[PDB]
Design an enzyme around this catalytic site. Structure first.
Site, short mmCIF file in Angstrom:
data_model
loop_
_atom_site.label_atom_id
_atom_site.label_comp_id
_atom_site.label_asym_id
_atom_site.label_seq_id
_atom_site.Cartn_x
_atom_site.Cartn_y
_atom_site.Cartn_z
N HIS A 67 -8.24 20.75 20.48
CA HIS A 67 -7.19 21.72 20.05
C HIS A 67 -6.84 22.19 21.56
CE1 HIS A 67 -11.12 23.90 20.55
NE2 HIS A 67 -10.32 25.00 20.64
N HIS A 100 -6.77 25.29 23.14
CA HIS A 100 -7.68 26.29 23.82
C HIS A 100 -7.94 25.56 25.40
CE1 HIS A 100 -9.05 28.85 20.38
NE2 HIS A 100 -7.83 29.51 20.95
N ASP A 110 -10.79 25.21 27.18
CA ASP A 110 -11.66 24.16 27.00
C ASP A 110 -11.68 23.06 26.66
OD1 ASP A 110 -11.62 25.56 24.56
OD2 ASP A 110 -13.66 25.76 24.33
N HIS A 145 -11.60 26.67 13.54
CA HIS A 145 -11.82 27.43 14.63
C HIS A 145 -10.39 27.71 15.18
CE1 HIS A 145 -12.82 28.24 18.68
NE2 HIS A 145 -11.83 27.35 19.30
N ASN A 164 -15.44 32.39 19.19
CA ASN A 164 -14.07 33.04 19.16
C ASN A 164 -13.44 32.80 18.04
OD1 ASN A 164 -11.44 33.61 20.08
ND2 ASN A 164 -11.37 31.57 21.07
C1 LIG Z 1 -16.02 31.47 25.70
C2 LIG Z 1 -16.00 30.36 25.11
C3 LIG Z 1 -14.65 29.48 24.93
C4 LIG Z 1 -13.42 30.32 25.17
C5 LIG Z 1 -12.92 31.42 24.24
O1 LIG Z 1 -13.80 32.13 23.63
O2 LIG Z 1 -11.83 31.95 24.39
C6 LIG Z 1 -12.28 29.27 25.17
C7 LIG Z 1 -11.61 29.10 26.33
O3 LIG Z 1 -11.58 29.75 24.00
N1 LIG Z 1 -14.68 29.28 23.61
C8 LIG Z 1 -15.55 29.69 22.72
C9 LIG Z 1 -15.67 29.41 21.35
O4 LIG Z 1 -16.12 30.36 20.37
O5 LIG Z 1 -15.12 28.50 20.88
C10 LIG Z 1 -16.71 30.51 23.77
S1 LIG Z 1 -18.17 29.64 23.49
C11 LIG Z 1 -19.11 30.28 22.01
C12 LIG Z 1 -19.87 31.57 22.50
N2 LIG Z 1 -21.30 31.61 21.96
C13 LIG Z 1 -21.37 30.10 21.29
C14 LIG Z 1 -22.56 29.14 21.76
O6 LIG Z 1 -23.23 28.56 20.97
N3 LIG Z 1 -22.57 28.76 23.22
C15 LIG Z 1 -23.54 27.78 23.59
C16 LIG Z 1 -22.32 29.68 24.39
C17 LIG Z 1 -20.00 29.27 21.56
ZN LIG Z 2 -11.14 27.16 20.89
ZN LIG Z 3 -14.43 26.35 22.38
#
Ligand SMILES: C[C@@H]1[C@H]([C@H](C(=O)O)[C@H](C)O)N=C(C(=O)O)[C@H]1S[C@@H]1CN[C@H](C(=O)N(C)C)C1
Ligand SMILES: [Zn+2]
Ligand SMILES: [Zn+2]
Ligand SMILES: [Zn+2]
Length: 232
Positions: A83, A85, A87, A148, A179
Site C-alpha cells: 500500500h 504509506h 513503510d 488499513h 494508524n
Molecule cells: C508508526 C507506524 C507506521 C506509520 C504510521 O503510523 O503512519 C506509517 C508510516 O504510516 N504505521 C503504523 C501502522 O499503524 O500501520 C505504525 S505502527 C503501529 C503502532 N503499534 C503497532 C505495533 O504492533 N507495533 C509493533 C509498533 C503498529
Molecule cells: Zn500504512
Molecule cells: Zn504500517
C-alpha cells in the site's frame, strides 16, 4: 527469537527465515518522535528474489539490499509495495536506482503520488475489485478490499503456505488498530473475512509490524478493528 524494535538500531535490517525460500525483513524507523518495527517479505523465485515492501526509508532500504546481497546473494529483480504509506514505498527510489523493477496497484501509485510519497514504477492490473487476485512470480497478490488503507494488498506464498498480511493485519500482542487515518473501518472486518475464506490453509501469517503467528492473526485483527469501531 524474532527481532523486536529494541534490538534493531534505526538504520539496520534483520532477515528472518520463515520457510524454504521465504524470509521476512525487519527494520525500524522513527515516526512522530517514536521508534517502530516494520516487516516486509523476501521470496525466492528460482535464481532471483521477489521483494515485498521496502524497509521504510531510503537509508533502511539500502541496508536491506546490502543485507540481502550479503546473506542470500541472489539479485532482487522485482519488488511489490502493498500500500501507499511510507513503510511500504519509502525507499522505492533506492530500489529503482539499484535496478529493481518496482510494482504496485494503480490505486497505490495514485495514492502515493497524492501523498507525496515515492511511487513504484509499474502498475499491477487486475486488483481493482475486492476479492481480486493475480499471480506474480512465486506469490499471489490479493486485494481483500479496503482495510488499513483503501488499496492494501496481501501476499500469499502457496508453496510455503505463508500469508503476508501487511498493515491490514495486526500482531497478536497488539490491542490497538494502529494508524487508522486512511483506513476504512466499516469495510476492514469484511476484507479480513475475505482473506480467511481465500487462504484457509495459511500456516504462517506475517503482520506489517510485529511478530508473525498462525492463522489467529486474521480473526484477532477483525476483533481489534471491531473493538475500535465500538469504542467510538
Ligand atoms: C508508526 C507506524 C507506521 C506509520 C504510521 O503510523 O503512519 C506509517 C508510516 O504510516 N504505521 C503504523 C501502522 O499503524 O500501520 C505504525 S505502527 C503501529 C503502532 N503499534 C503497532 C505495533 O504492533 N507495533 C509493533 C509498533 C503498529
Ligand atoms: Zn500504512
Ligand atoms: Zn504500517
Ligand atoms: Zn502493468
Amino acid at each position: 527469537e524474532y527481532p523486536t524494535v529494541n534490538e534493531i538500531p534505526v538504520g539496520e535490517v534483520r532477515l528472518y527465515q520463515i520457510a524454504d525460500g521465504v524470509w521476512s525483513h525487519i527494520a525500524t524507523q522513527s515516526f512522530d518522535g517514536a521508534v517502530y518495527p516494520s516487516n516486509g517479505l523476501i521470496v525466492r523465485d528460482g535464481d532471483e528474489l521477489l521483494l515485498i515492501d521496502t524497509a521504510w526509508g531510503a537509508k533502511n532500504t539500502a541496508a536491506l539490499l546490502a543485507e540481502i546481497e550479503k546473506q542470500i546473494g541472489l539479485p532482487v529483480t522485482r519488488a511489490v509495495s502493498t500500500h501507499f504509506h511510507d513503510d511500504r514505498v519509502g525507499g522505492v527510489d533506492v530500489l529503482r536506482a539499484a535496478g529493481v523493477a518496482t510494482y504496485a496497484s494503480p490505486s497505490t501509485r495514485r495514492l502515493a503520488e497524492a501523498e507525496g510519497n515515492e511511487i513504484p514504477t509499474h502498475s499491477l492490473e487486475g486488483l481493482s475489485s475486492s476479492g481480486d487476485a493475480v499471480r506474480f512470480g512465486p506469490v499471489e497478490l490479493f486485494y481483500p478490499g479496503a482495510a488499513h488503507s483503501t488499496d492494501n494488498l496481501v501476499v500469499y506464498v502457496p508453496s510455503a503456505n505463508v500469508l503476508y498480511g501487511g498493515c491490514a493485519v495486526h500482531e497478536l500482542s497488539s490491542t490497538s488498530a494502529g494508524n487508522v487515518a486512511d483506513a476504512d473501518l466499516a469495510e476492514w472486518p469484511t476484507s479480513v473475512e475475505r482473506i480467511q475464506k481465500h487462504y484457509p490453509e495459511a500456516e504462517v501469517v506475517i503482520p506489517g509490524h510485529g511478530l508473525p503467528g498462525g492463522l489467529d492473526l486474521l480473526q484477532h485483527t477483525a476483533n481489534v478493528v471491531k473493538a475500535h469501531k465500538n469504542r467510538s
